[PDB]
């Protein structure tokens, strides 16, 4: 039972590295895109104002 | 993306698990060399009393 409860003490509490790391990298890439998307949106109001001096 | 540099809670949490993880590991490398799983009363106080009596 000690072996069985330790086996059940995994995928319940113990994390895996296979599916969770690609979620970490996906989130990190998403954060990279999310930080970059505002870098292409900050100049949009400036260009909008640029029609008139 | 949440910009912040005056604090890094991710590093603080990682350090908190860092300290706890190899604190127990530091308790190792000594039980192996000594050959005893009891070396200090802070580990198992009840075990120390009975082990000394035995």
Interface of A with B in 10-49 (CB under 8 A): 31, 34-35, 38
Could you tell me the resolution of this structure in angstroms?
A: 3.2
Nearest-neighbour CA in chain B from A53: distance (Å):
32
Residue matched to tokens 């949440």: B2
Q: Which of B27, B28, B21 is nearest to B42 (CA)?
A: B27
Tokens 């900050």 correspond to A42
Q: Which residues contact B43 (CB under 8 A, 6 or more apart)?
A: B27, B37
CA distance A34 to chain B (A): 6
| Structure-token match 């200090």, residue found | B40
Listed in sequence order, the residues at least 6 apart from B44 whose beta carbon sits closer than 8 Å to its beta carbon are: B38
Experimental technique of record:
cryo-EM
Residue B34 CA to residue B26 CA, distance in Å, equals 13
Chain A positions in Cβ-Cβ contact with residue B1 (cut-off 8 Å)? 31, 34-35, 38
A4 in helix, strand or coil?
A: helix
Residue in B9, B10, B42, B36 with CA at minimum distance from that of residue B23: B42
């Amino acid at each position: 039972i000690n072996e069985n409860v330790n086996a059940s003490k995994s995928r319940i509490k113990d994390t895996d590295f296979a599916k969770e790391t690609t979620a970490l990298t996906k989130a990190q890439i998403l954060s990279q895109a999310s930080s970059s998307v505002l870098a292409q949106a900050k100049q949009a109001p400036n260009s909008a104002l640029a029609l008139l001096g | 993306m949440a910009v912040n540099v005056n604090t890094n809670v991710s590093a603080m949490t990682a350090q908190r698990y860092l300290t706890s993880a190899t604190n127990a590991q530091q308790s190792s490398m000594e039980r192996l060399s000594s050959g005893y799983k009891i070396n200090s009363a802070k580990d198992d106080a009840a075990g120390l009393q009975i082990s000394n009596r035995l």
